[PDB]
Amino acid sequence: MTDLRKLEALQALHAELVAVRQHRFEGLQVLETLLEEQTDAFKALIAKPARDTKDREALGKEPKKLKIGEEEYSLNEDFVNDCLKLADELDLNEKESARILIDCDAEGDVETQSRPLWECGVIRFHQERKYLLDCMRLILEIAADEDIDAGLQESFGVAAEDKIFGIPPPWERQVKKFIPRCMEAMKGVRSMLQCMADKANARNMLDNQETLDFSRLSLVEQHECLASILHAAVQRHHATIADFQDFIKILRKWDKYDHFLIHLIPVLAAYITEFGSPEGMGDLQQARRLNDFICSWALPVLGAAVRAWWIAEHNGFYLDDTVQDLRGINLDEEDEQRTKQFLDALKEGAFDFILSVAADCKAQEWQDPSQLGARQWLQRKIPSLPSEPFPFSHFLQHSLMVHLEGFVDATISNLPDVLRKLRTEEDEQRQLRPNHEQDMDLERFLIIISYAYEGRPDAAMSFWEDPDSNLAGFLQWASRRASTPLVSAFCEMLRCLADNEECATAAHNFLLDEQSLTWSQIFKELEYFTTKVCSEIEPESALMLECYLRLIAKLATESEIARKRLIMDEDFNLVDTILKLSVGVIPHRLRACIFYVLKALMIRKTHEELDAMWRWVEAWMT
Amino acid sequence: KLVINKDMRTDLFSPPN
Amino acid sequence: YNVVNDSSDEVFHFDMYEWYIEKGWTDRILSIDSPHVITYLQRLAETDFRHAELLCRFYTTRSRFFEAAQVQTNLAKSDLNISLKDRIILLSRAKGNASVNTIGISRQQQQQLNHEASELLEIAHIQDDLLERLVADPRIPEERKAEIEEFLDGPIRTL
């Protein structure tokens, strides 16, 4: 139709944005026509008129005829009761609340859902904020898409500056900035959600359960959209120090761990990147004050992670003495200060919190049984989520992985001596007291690196292109003599860094000799464990065997040269070892891993390989 | 739609009546 | 104010809409969900500028920009007692409101209105530049200026 209401206007507009995002430009002329009709909507993100007494007393005094804009309607004793109910639950003005209910009668959605008329008003109200805010994310997302025409990419850019951020275009030109409205906007969502649980829990302590669940889902989605919009706005260098201080204070006043903190994490990450790192407001003098300001907290792990990130990002200034001025300043004292601060942050559990957040972010309802118990053998002391149905999006995960990989690169290219001293400390601690379990800082860091580099071959290739870079340097340095946990973490990292065939072949060529880990030692340990079981076993040995089996299966499924070599290698004879191990007394996990390795090796085979496999199976089963 | 007609106007520099 | 909003007297609520308008309480009138006030305005919108402005506010906040551009344009072309400068504001608003999408209305219908408002706004600015200059001109007799102000400070004239 052409005369669509507010709800139908936003729903139709959303479909158009998806078309342009999915490589469908058949609605260019129709898209521009909608932004002009909803100009007043994009200006204010979310604002509910306060409940006024003039309309409350007037609505109930003469509930006979209602006049909204140009049209006229008649109020009856039944409809009038729904207006007061909707206005009370949401604390919305009677005039605005009535318009929402009128839209339901016209569209006639009461029969499509079979719910009370007053309840539909709550859903219709939440739908407006959903599309009104969700559509904004698509505009900025399409404005940053590099796989589209440069002309179209710029059209949505300037439009967002004026429609969303209220900044006029360059060819023209009391008002309030966007951030202060966004901060107050998100605040209303929190206060509205808090009062919702208090009132809902009171009456609960019905047919509206699903409606309350849908409203909570819409609220969390709107909060995520507002967080993404704030992140995008900050990415354009449109912030200041006051907003940063306010955000830091809000974080310090954080009470409970929930999805909102995970959504705000990237906001603080971008803040530190713009201010802390030398990729933004490059005011060296200003950075000194922020350092002392950051370096009250109701949750020490948050402050530890914040300080660690700030140090990692701000240690890039003190690399050379030619791109900036470093006169009349001592270096060793500041280096020792940053080192002790990072050590304290580690002891407080910064990497632990980062790993817990990364794990809770990608929480999947179902997981492949081929990777059970992987990366779940640590000591997690951080409380988990309440398990409520709040699934995450994809852009948020992408941004989180990008920020994590950036932090990893920064920490590897800025603080190598820190990692060296930490590894030496862990080694000497495990040596002087083997009965005790030393800290898992390095293992947690490697697991975080693995989580960051997952399904992103464009970034994983960086570890193979330049073998003389810092990334390859750390990769080859982390393969020397170490304990079982570090070897297992490195094997898991290698397995997760094989999303394609090229990376698998690169890892295969780098693992074998051309000291670092080699297939020779792996097979020697396999044969040793086989002879020991066949003439007990510790959890570390089982974990190492499972990691080796998973890595072999991944390499065989991804690479071809390894599959063709190991299958007929005379010096390895992996099949015999895995069979002698499976026929022994061991848990079912090792047998399952061996079976999956066999499957991977036999994913692509020929007549000779089939004959050999059948011969071995018959010989070992007869 | 413009139509110039210098012929019959109203003297802009003389009062009315 | 409870007793007021709890009434079902319709002539009363009409008299109160008029009274809110009089006192200037755009605060409380724009905050009424009801269509009853919209319908009341739709009958007297094309009767008075102040009422039309209220009607257009209700449309815009409901993303019905094209309908407001229609009310504003007709008001600028009308023979109501409206000053030229007020007719420049009406056209300028209509031009903006017709340049943005309004759902349920064809791109062709939007552009044709945005084009009519753009042309009439161009003529209106010319007329305003003339009237201002003529009134201020030292070489124009006072007797003529009053006559110029009568014929140019009103509906928009042909080029």
d(CA A16, CA A14) in angstroms, rounded, equals: 5
**Neighbors of chain A by Cβ distance (3+ pairs < 8 Å):** C
Among B1, B2, B16, beta carbon nearest to C147: B16
A·C CB contacts under 8 A: 237
Contacts of A415 (CB under 8 A, 6+ apart): A311, A312, A315, A342
Q: Are C33 and A72 inside 8 Å of each other by CB? A: no
Whether A535 contacts A590, CB under 8 Å:
no
Amino acid at site A592: A
Task: Report chain C residues whose CB lies below 8 A from the CB of A63.
Answer: 6-8
Length of chain C: 159
Distance of CA A234 to the CA centre of its chain: 18
Q: Are A75 and C36 inside 8 Å of each other by CB? A: yes
Task: Report chain C residues whose CB lies below 8 A from the CB of A106.
Answer: none
Burial of A465 (0-12, 13-18, 19+ CB in 10 A): exposed
Contacts of C57 (CB under 8 A, 6+ apart): C26, C30
CA distances from C133 to A140, A348, C122, C136, C143 (A): 47, 76, 17, 5, 16
d(CA A523, CA A574) in angstroms, rounded, equals: 7
Length of chain B: 17
Task: Report chain B residues whose CB lies below 8 A from the CB of C140.
Answer: 12-13
Q: Are A101 and C35 inside 8 Å of each other by CB? A: no
Burial of B10 (0-12, 13-18, 19+ CB in 10 A): exposed
Among C37, C97, C107, beta carbon nearest to A30: C107
Whether A70 contacts C67, CB under 8 Å:
yes
Residue in C123, C134, C144 to test binding to B, most B beta-carbons within 10 Å: C144
Distance in Å, alpha carbon of A207 to nearest chain C alpha carbon: 26
Whether A228 contacts A137, CB under 8 Å:
yes
Give me C84's structure tokens. Answer: 């030229």
Whether A459 contacts A467, CB under 8 Å:
no
Contacts of A44 (CB under 8 A, 6+ apart): A181
Give me C52's structure tokens. Answer: 């039309």
Q: Residue A308: which of A258, A361, A275, A348 has the closest Cα?
A: A348
- From the CB of residue A205, how many other CB atoms can be counted at a distance below 10 Å? 5
Q: Are A67 and C98 inside 8 Å of each other by CB? A: no
Q: Residue A554: which of A517, A525, A596, A606 has the closest Cα?
A: A596
Whether A539 contacts A586, CB under 8 Å:
no
d(CA A81, CA A89) in angstroms, rounded, equals: 13
Which residue has 């946990």 as its token pair?
A485
d(CA A439, CA A443) in angstroms, rounded, equals: 9
Resolution (Å) of this entry: 23.0
Task: Report chain B residues whose CB lies below 8 A from the CB of C141.
Answer: 13, 15
Angle at Cα A400 formed by Cα A553 and Cα A260, nearest 5°? 125
Longest Cα–Cα distance in chain B: 30
Contacts of A15 (CB under 8 A, 6+ apart): none
**Cross-strand partners of C36:** A67
Whether C152 contacts C127, CB under 8 Å:
yes
Q: Residue A36: which of C113, C146, C134 has the closest Cα?
A: C113
Contacts of A207 (CB under 8 A, 6+ apart): A115
First vs last Cα of chain B: how many Å apart? 30
Whether A216 contacts A224, CB under 8 Å:
no
Give me A264's structure tokens. Answer: 């705000």
- From the CB of residue A424, how many other CB atoms can be counted at a distance below 10 Å? 10
d(CA A116, CA A128) in angstroms, rounded, equals: 19
d(CA A504, CA A494) in angstroms, rounded, equals: 9
Q: Residue C102: which of C134, C138, C56 has the closest Cα?
A: C56
The pairing of strands A71-74 and A65-68 is antiparallel
Angle between helices A209-234 and A117-143 (to 10 degrees): 20
Query: Solved how?
Result: cryo-EM
d(CA C84, CA C86) in angstroms, rounded, equals: 5
Whether C6 contacts A64, CB under 8 Å:
no
d(CA A67, CA C13) in angstroms, rounded, equals: 10
Task: Report chain C residues whose CB lies below 8 A from the CB of A54.
Answer: 1, 4-5, 20, 25, 27-28, 31
Task: Report chain C residues whose CB lies below 8 A from the CB of B14.
Answer: 144
Residue in A2, A52, A68, A163 to test binding to C, most C beta-carbons within 10 Å: A68
Angle between helices A519-534 and A574-582 (to 10 degrees): 30
Distance in Å, alpha carbon of A465 to nearest chain C alpha carbon: 50
Angle at Cα A554 formed by Cα A488 and Cα A368, nearest 5°? 90
d(CA A110, CA A115) in angstroms, rounded, equals: 6
Distance of CA A312 to the CA centre of its chain: 20
d(CA A485, CA A339) in angstroms, rounded, equals: 25
Length of chain A: 622
Amino acid at site A202: A
Distance in Å, alpha carbon of C142 to nearest chain A alpha carbon: 39
Whether A123 contacts A131, CB under 8 Å:
no
Give me A208's structure tokens. Answer: 């509206």
Interface check A405 vs C, CB under 8 A: no
Whether A86 contacts C33, CB under 8 Å:
no
Q: Are C158 and B2 inside 8 Å of each other by CB? A: yes
Longest Cα–Cα distance in chain C: 64
First vs last Cα of chain A: how many Å apart? 75
Burial of C38 (0-12, 13-18, 19+ CB in 10 A): buried
CA distances from C134 to A209, B9, B17 (A): 72, 17, 21
Contacts of A95 (CB under 8 A, 6+ apart): A49, A55, A68, C30, C31, C32, C33, C34, C37
Contacts 24+ apart (CB under 8 A), A384-387: A384/A356, A384/A360, A385/A257, A385/A258, A385/A259, A385/A360, A386/A258
Q: Can you list the alpha helix ranges (DSSP code H) found in A415-500?
A: 416-432, 441-452, 457-460, 462-465, 470-477, 484-496
Longest Cα–Cα distance in chain A: 96
Phi and psi at residue A539, to the nearest 5°: -60, -35
Residue in A7, A52, A61 to test binding to C, most C beta-carbons within 10 Å: A61
Q: Tell me which residues of chain A, numbers 344 to 383, contact chain C at a CB-CB cutoff of 8 Å.
A: none
Q: Are A3 and C105 inside 8 Å of each other by CB? A: yes
Residue in C101, C107, C108 to test binding to A, most A beta-carbons within 10 Å: C101
Q: Which residue of C has its CA nearest to B10?
A: C144
Q: Can you list the alpha helix ranges (DSSP code H) found in A26-116?
A: 28-37, 39-43, 53-61, 77-90, 94-107, 110-113
| Rg, C-alpha atoms of chain B | 11
Contacts of A129 (CB under 8 A, 6+ apart): A46, A218, A222
Give me A93's structure tokens. Answer: 């003005």
Q: Are B2 and C147 inside 8 Å of each other by CB? A: no
Interface check C141 vs B, CB under 8 A: yes
Interface check C22 vs B, CB under 8 A: no
d(CA A268, CA A244) in angstroms, rounded, equals: 8
Contacts of A421 (CB under 8 A, 6+ apart): A339
Among C5, C17, C45, beta carbon nearest to A57: C5
Task: Report chain C residues whose CB lies below 8 A from the CB of A100.
Answer: 33
CA distances from A312 to A274, A303, A345, A460 (A): 13, 14, 12, 21
Task: Report chain B residues whose CB lies below 8 A from the CB of C143.
Answer: 15-16
Q: Which residue of B has its CA nearest to C137?
A: B13
* DSSP letters for A365-419: SS--GGGTTTT--S---S------S----SHHHHHHHHHHHHHHHHHHHH-HHHH
Among C141, C158, C159, beta carbon nearest to B13: C141
